[PDB]
Amino acid sequence: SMEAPKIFERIQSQTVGQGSDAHFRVRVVGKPDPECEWYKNGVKIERSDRIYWYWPEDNVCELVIRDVTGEDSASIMVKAINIAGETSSHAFLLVQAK
């Protein structure tokens, strides 16, 4: 008895000073536990030392974009998926210089 992912808490838009770190969090459940995928301007995010996502809590998937630059302003999208379905949540990241 599989259950499609359901977002309880959507991601919120962030306006962050260039050089600071951007954080995005979604609370989502599903059976099996859904995998979490993040997209920056439509491009799927892969982990690096600057940008990665993790599970700070079992039902919270978080994206961290460290030391942002103007080049990081973007539409941010998280997609939670498991064998029963997928769902997504959207926000933007707006970077401000100095």
Fold and architecture overview:
The chain has strands at residues 3-9, 14-17, 22-31, 35-40, 43-44, 51-57, 60-65, 74-82, 85-96. It is mostly beta strands. It has one domain (1-98): Immunoglobulins (Immunoglobulin-like, Sandwich), CATH 2.60.40.10. It has a five-stranded mixed β-sheet, with no helix packed on it. A four-stranded antiparallel β-sheet has the order 1-3-7-6, with no helix packed on it. This is Titin. It comes from Homo sapiens (Human). It is found in: Cytoplasm; Nucleus.
Looking at this structure, what is the CATH superfamily? Answer: Immunoglobulins
Domains, number: 1
Return Rg in Å: 14 Å
Largest sheet: 5 strands, mixed
Looking at the structure, the CATH topology is: Immunoglobulin-like
What is the CATH class designation? Mainly Beta
Number of strands: 9
Secondary-structure-derived class: mainly beta
Order of helices and strands: EEEEEEEEE
- What general outline do the C-alpha atoms trace? elongated
Oligomer: monomer
Helix content: under 10%
Strand order of the largest sheet: 2-9-8-4-5
Number of helices: 0
Task: Report the portion of residues in β strands.
Answer: over 45%
Ends distance:
52 Å
Name of the CATH architecture: Sandwich
Protein name: Titin
Family: Belongs to the protein kinase superfamily. CAMK Ser/Thr protein kinase family.
Subcellular location: Cytoplasm; Nucleus
PDB class: structural protein
